[PDB]
Each structure stands twice: as structure tokens, then as C-alpha cells.
Amino acid sequence: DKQKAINYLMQFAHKVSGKYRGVAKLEGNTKAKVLQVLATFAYADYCRSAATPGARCRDCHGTGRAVDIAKTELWGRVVEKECGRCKGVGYSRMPASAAYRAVTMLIPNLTQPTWSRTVKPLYDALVVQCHKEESIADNILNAVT
Ligand SMILES: [Br-]
Ligand SMILES: [Cl-]
Ligand SMILES: [Zn+2]
């Protein structure tokens, strides 16, 4: 069930919600609903971009990152750098306005520039979180062992 995936993304949203002031201070019920909406639109945004030619950078597949070979070897652990191809952008940011409208149903006083600064970053963190997940699983499935 994809609800399981959206809910898992929602659990993550709740964990990092403290970093975003637009959500960190909401009443419990409202916060839960807002995170549910962000998780639901972010996931749909991820899915669409992955199945749509050109919607994701073809080098990083949405993460906007690449492995720094030298540093990974130096530090004995995976060290990442920006993906040059998309300059770290990874996916289109246009789908976010639909999510903004949905969130305004819950926080009616929220303006777009305020959402942009205090809530949207959480939305984007959830979208890239999905790309990163896919990438890690990819690395795992195709590891020359
Ligand atoms: Br998920
Ligand atoms: Cl937006
Ligand atoms: Zn890229």
C-alpha cells in the first residue's frame, strides 16, 4: 500500500519538523494534518518526477548529489559533492504550489513567501528524501560486492 510509504515519509517529517519554524510551533492536531499533506504531495511529486522523462537530472536522479571519489577514499566513508549536471537542483520545484494551496486549507493565514521560508524547506526535504532513498537502495542492489 502506498499509504505505508506516505506514512513512513510522514514519520520522518515529524522527526525533523523542529528545524522548520513554520511547523515546529503548531498545535498537535494541526501539525499532524499539515505533515500528512506535505508527505502526501511530496511523495506524489517524487513518483511523478521519477516516471517522467526529463523531470529528474539523469546523473543524480533527483538527489542533486554525487560521490566525491577522492574524499570517500580518504575518509573511509561515503563523501558527497554537488551534482554538476543539475548544479544540485535534482528535481523541478513547480509542483510545490499545489502543496502550498493544500497547506493553506489548514493554515489559512499562511502567505506564499512565508511558506517559502518557513514551511516549503520541509516539503523539499521530504521530496529529496525520497530520491535519496531510491539512490541508496540502488547503490545497495548494484554493489559490486
Ligand atoms: Br517512503
Ligand atoms: Cl511554492
Ligand atoms: Zn543532478
Curated annotation (Swiss-Prot):
Site note Interaction with host rpoB applies to: 40, 99, 104
Segments traversing the membrane: none
Q: What is the effect of changing residue 73 to K?
A: Increased binding to QBE and increased suppressor activity
First and last residues of each zinc finger (unnamed): 57-86
**Regions recorded as binding DNA:** 110-131
Q: What residues does Zn(2+) bind to? A: 57, 60, 83, 86
Keyword annotations for this protein? DNA-binding, Host-virus interaction, Metal-binding, Transcription, Transcription regulation, Transcription termination, Zinc, Zinc-finger
Some GO term, biological process aspect, for this entry: which one? transcription antitermination
Record annotation: effect of changing residue 128 to E: Increased suppressor activity
Q: What GO molecular-function term can you cite, just one? A: zinc ion binding
| Chain positions of site Interaction with host RNA polymerase sigma factor RPOD | 73
Quaternary structure note: Interacts with host RPOB (via flap domain); this interaction renders host RNAP resistant to transcription pausing and allows it to read through termination signals. Interacts with host RNA polymerase sigma factor RPOD (via domain-4). Interacts with host NUSA (via N-terminus and AR2 domain); this interaction releases the autoinhibition of NUSA.
What does the protein in this record do?
Mediates the switch from middle to viral late gene expression by associating with host RNA polymerase (RNAP) so that the latter can read without pausing and through transcription terminators preceding late genes. Competes with host factor sigma 70 for binding to RPOB, the beta-subunit of host RNAP. To join the elongation complex, binds a specific DNA Q-binding element (QBE) and interacts with RNAP that is paused during early elongation. Participates in the lysis-lysogeny decision by activating the expression of the late lytic genes.
What family is this?
A: Belongs to the phage antitermination Q type 2 family.
Identify this protein by name. Antitermination protein Q
Gene of this entry: Q
